[PDB]
Amino acid sequence: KAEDLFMEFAHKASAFNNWCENVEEDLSEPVHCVS
């Protein structure tokens, strides 16, 4: 089936994109802390 080949990529692209944004915004915190 041709459409299934498009649509499983349609799932995985959004998951990859939001995982990338999650690791984008967990990263930039300056974290000084101590010791």
């Binding site: 349609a10 998951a15 915004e25």
Partner: protein, 113 residues
């Protein structure tokens, strides 16, 4: 430590609020393609957007959880966090309502063709 995580709360909620505004802007406009093929293509693009929004519902829930962390810890400024939290929740509920209306719009256009 708790003031640092409050300032992280502000910095984290900024992106969420801007994104709620941005998909408000893009679900606002309506441009259906001509005839049934383009109409159903727009329908499945809407379902793609609807599957996309459920990904960030989780992040909004994480923002909820770290927001109620403050009131568990009895922060000096409760009103700030509580107001920003439930306004964010209200705006997300409004975006769901607009998505549902947009969907019902497209089943009507599918059904009369």
């Amino acid at each position: 430590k708790l003031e640092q995580l409050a300032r992280r709360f502000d910095r984290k909620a900024a992106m969420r609020e801007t994104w709620l505004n941005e998909n408000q802007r893009l679900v606002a406009q309506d441009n259906f393609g001509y005839d049934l093929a383009a109409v159903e293509a727009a329908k499945k693009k809407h379902e793609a957007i609807e599957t996309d929004t459920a990904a960030y519902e989780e992040r909004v829930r994480a923002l909820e959880d770290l927001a109620r962390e403050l009131e568990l810890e009895n922060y000096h400024d409760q009103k700030r966090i509580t107001a920003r939290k439930d306004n964010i929740l209200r705006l997300w509920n409004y975006l769901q309502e607009l998505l549902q209306s947009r969907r019902q719009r497209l089943e009507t256009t599918l059904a009369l063709q």
